[PDB]
Amino acid sequence: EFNILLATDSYKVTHYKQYPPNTSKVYSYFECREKKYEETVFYGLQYILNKYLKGKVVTKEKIQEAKDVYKEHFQDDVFNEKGWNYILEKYDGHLPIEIKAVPEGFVIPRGNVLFTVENTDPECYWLTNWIETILVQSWYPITVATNSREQKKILAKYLLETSGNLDGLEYKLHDFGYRGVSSQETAGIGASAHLVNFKGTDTVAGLALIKKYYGTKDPVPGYSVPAAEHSTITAWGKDHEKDAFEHIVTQFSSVPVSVVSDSYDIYNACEKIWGEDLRHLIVSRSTQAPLIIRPDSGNPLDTVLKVLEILGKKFPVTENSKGYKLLPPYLRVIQGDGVDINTLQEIVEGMKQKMWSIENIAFGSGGGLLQKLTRDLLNCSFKCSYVVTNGLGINVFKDPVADPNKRSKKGRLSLHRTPAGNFVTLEEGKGDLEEYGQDLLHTVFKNGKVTKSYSFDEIRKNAQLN
Amino acid sequence: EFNILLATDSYKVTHYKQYPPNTSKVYSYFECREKKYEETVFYGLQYILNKYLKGKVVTKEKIQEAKDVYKEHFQDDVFNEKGWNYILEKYDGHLPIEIKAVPEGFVIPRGNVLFTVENTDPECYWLTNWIETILVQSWYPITVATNSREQKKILAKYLLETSGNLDGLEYKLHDFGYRGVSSQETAGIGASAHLVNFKGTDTVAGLALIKKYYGTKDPVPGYSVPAAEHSTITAWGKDHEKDAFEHIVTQFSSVPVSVVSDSYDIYNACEKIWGEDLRHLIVSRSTQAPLIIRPDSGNPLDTVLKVLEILGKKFPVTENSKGYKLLPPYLRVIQGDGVDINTLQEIVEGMKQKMWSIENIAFGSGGGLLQKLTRDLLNCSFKCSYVVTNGLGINVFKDPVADPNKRSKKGRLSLHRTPAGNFVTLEEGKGDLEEYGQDLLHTVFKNGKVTKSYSFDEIRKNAQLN
Ligand SMILES: Nc1ccc(/C=C/C(=O)NCc2cc3cc(-c4ccc(C(=O)N5CCC(F)(F)CC5)cc4)cc(-c4ccc(F)cc4)c3o2)cn1
Ligand SMILES: Nc1ccc(/C=C/C(=O)NCc2cc3cc(-c4ccc(C(=O)N5CCC(F)(F)CC5)cc4)cc(-c4ccc(F)cc4)c3o2)cn1
Secondary structure (H helix, E strand, O other): OOOHHHOOEHHHHHHHHOOOOOEEEEEEEEEEOOOOOOEEEOOOHHHHHHHHHOOOOOOHHHHHHHHHHHHHHHOOOOOOHHHHHHHHHHHOOOOOEEEEEOOOOOEEEOOOEEEEEEEOOHHHOOHHHHOHHHHHOOHHHHHHHHHHHHHHHHHHHHHHHHHOOOOOHHHOEEEOOOOOOOOHHHHHHHHHHHOOOOOEEOEOHHHHHHHHHOOOOOOOOOEOOOEOOHHHHHOOOHHHHHHHHHHHHHHOOOOOEEEEOOOOOHHHHHHHHHHHHOHHHOOOOOOOOOEEEEOOOOOHHHHHHHHHHHHHHHOOOEEOOOOOEEOOOOEEEEEOOOOOHHHHHHHHHHHHHOOEOHHHEEEEEOHHHHOOOOOOOOOEEEEEEEEEEOOEEEEOOOOOOOOHHHOOOOOOOEEEEOOOOOEEEEOOOHHHHOOOOOOOOEEEEEOOEEOOOOOHHHHHHHOOOO | OOOHHHOOEHHHHHHHHOOOOOEEEEEEEEEEOOOOOOEEEOOOHHHHHHHHHOOOOOOHHHHHHHHHHHHHHOOOOOOOHHHHHHHHHHHOOOOOEEEEEOOOOOEEEOOOEEEEEEEOOHHHOOHHHHOHHHHHOOHHHHHHHHHHHHHHHHHHHHHHHHOOOOOOHHHOEEEOOOOOOOOHHHHHHHHHHHOOOOOEEOEOHHHHHHHHHOOOOOOOOOEOOOEOOHHHHHOOOHHHHHHHHHHHHHHOOOOOEEEEOOOOOHHHHHHHHHHHHOHHHOOOOOOOOOEEEEOOOOOHHHHHHHHHHHHHHHOOOEEOOOOOEEOOOOEEEEEOOOOOHHHHHHHHHHHHHOOEOHHHEEEEEOHHHHOOOOOOOOOEEEEEEEEEEOOEEEEOOOOOOOOHHHOOOOOOOEEEEOOOOOEEEEOOOHHHHOOOOOOOOEEEEEOOEEOOOOOHHHHHHHOOOO
């Protein structure tokens, strides 16, 4: 079973011997520090509160096991068995901590307070920063949900220019990242952060996470359609690629189907196999069940353009009201190789220069969507800003001489709306002056109980585009 | 509870209707595809065999739950209920699969087969590639262990040159990445892969993973020392940084202690606080308990060089047998900000240029060691290379015209030793000719059971440097 006594940075085990004596309160905050990515989607804290922090988390056996492990780890006795036994006997193992956050789904500019942590018992001054390590890991669902939303902005801009509406926007980016992430638990959390902005996912693990910790009115938050891989094509033999194509579109003639076509020669497959030999099985398909050709190699922009030119000469093309070319409704294209936020912008801009509408194409991303992200992308940081010693409170901060970008905020913090409708974080307890309205932070956790929750439905609504 | 029926890519559920009819065998393999990082460390397979693949993995309840989820996910009933009911009734929920693999810890050049997967029942031809997604995730411990070993190579070269031996090598790179990874399960896997090469870690979760799935002779595989953070220094007050230093070094006066010193001015704390105000508490410390000064901001190379020049003028410096300068044995330095494999080489080369020995310094890394890594750094890939249909086996392969590097191998594979002592992978069953000796892969999994395993002590021995 999970042991919260073994889920911290090793060195923090010794921090109860370094704080100033006669200290009764430690107050810390989380932010996406200022330095692209000017606003962040706050999401994922609710998952950590329920799975790791709520309820009875301390037992006599868990204290004894931490004592045994840390004895050999440090080659010394340094564990705070006395402090952890006080929580067990007085609060039945419930953590005496209060956490205030911003509602999940909110879009907030860089450099503002997103949540605060503090202890509610003077004896547990050391407990505030013990749970820093587990809490800081919220940088991952924040960054996945932000980076996915910024890719939605690019897609929405070019779809509106070339078509005149946003029909089908919310399944133009499919999640191919299950096998490209570092673990099973990461796959579930990352695919859920992507479903805040889109609807298509191949990463099954994200569905069960949402229903267990968030919930939705619909049966499932994500959907998929049948598709082929290189094994189900090459298994027929090099000389029988056309046999594998005919068989697969016939088994799935009533639903959409994606077919990877670059096993040997992608341009041969589009012009000769799809566009001639099997053309009669494509033009008869329904608008609700098109064929989706999938290239998978080469230069991403050059391959998409050459593919569209080949298909345009073999199938009837129309011109929409904005002047851009459009394929017949029974034929589309999906590009799912080498796709990140940078390449996605290069592709749609190139398609627009060649007078091709964004209606024709959708995208898929694997490692770029779920794995190629770090904690310094948005500079997520956790720092102490207020302590009480000998009954008097002081403001605490850091300010390295060689880097003013690492300066931290001072005192008790609060988040408010500006008169022009923006955000501002007030320091040194100045929010008590009541000049900026109501603090937008809400108590989500106190003394081992989750005091306020949000559904996955409200979160999607909070993260909408303008 | 984990359900293997929900731990695959969505599309793989629709693959049992796409293979050629009368197919009784699907045979697939894993490689680090060829085109820095010329050889890879194979580690991580055993963890996945025990936690997810062995034993009764199919029940009547798990079949019904996967059925219910897929009807909403696909808006159809494509799920293969009949295939999974046969495995339950015929094999008591045990997977009829055989896996062969190279011994864990082995160092193998790029472009060689590392493990193979095939079905042992003709009815379960679809099972081989169903477990591709879970097995491909072994890319992460392989890449962490490889990138960590390459960093050990750089440190060994410059330590031997500036000092004359390798004393202290196994803890010159400490793992700081607990808070910087994407989940709790990722932290345990990645820290365990780092301990293959080094012995210092702050990510506690790696210790329990090793003892449960690999085992070691000693009580624990990793160690740590007491250290400060920014909250335990700045909580004393801006004008009281000296008081915090004196307290911390007195509480830990008999063991090594690391003290972050860049809260306000790193260069002032080195020259005036450590080098003047508190110098009498440093020169009295034991060689087994030095003070370790830790900078944490600015340019990594420029800061380290200036910190060394300051201390060299406040403390007695000697010259070792190779001519390089050395601090007194009670004074060391650790640099744990912005360290990856690129900057680690720049720092160590610049230290040598200024005649400073590598004995004076250690390093720590967080996001660069455990998070800033993807699946295409080593080109880890899983592909089918052999099937049997109508009783006749054929060689299958992919070969895209726009990317010769994506070409895969054909037929039954085997790994052998060359007469000069190198590795070669034989294709198309040519290993049966017995011209290259015996196959180096070993059956590690068969019909639901682990058939061969390795201890963490054997893995470390196999992964040693030349
Ligand atoms: N490692 C890997 C893993 C996988 C792969 C290759 C995967 C692949 O090719 N996927 C194709 C694909 C999925 C998909 C899902 C949707 C989709 C998403 C959401 C909804 C939805 O909101 N609802 C459906 C259910 C409902 F009830 F109807 C109301 C709500 C519907 C469909 C749409 C298209 C599509 C793409 C391009 C097109 F042109 C057309 C469709 C889709 O295309 C490669 N490597
Ligand atoms: N998010 C985070 C997390 C942490 C931080 C800052 C952390 C910090 O400052 N850590 C200091 C530190 C630990 C440490 C461990 C060892 C160590 C590791 C392994 C062994 C070992 O091999 N064994 C244990 C004992 C044994 F019994 F022999 C068997 C084997 C011994 C020591 C050595 C030094 C050191 C650093 C610099 C020096 F100059 C010298 C030492 C060490 O220094 C920042 N952000």
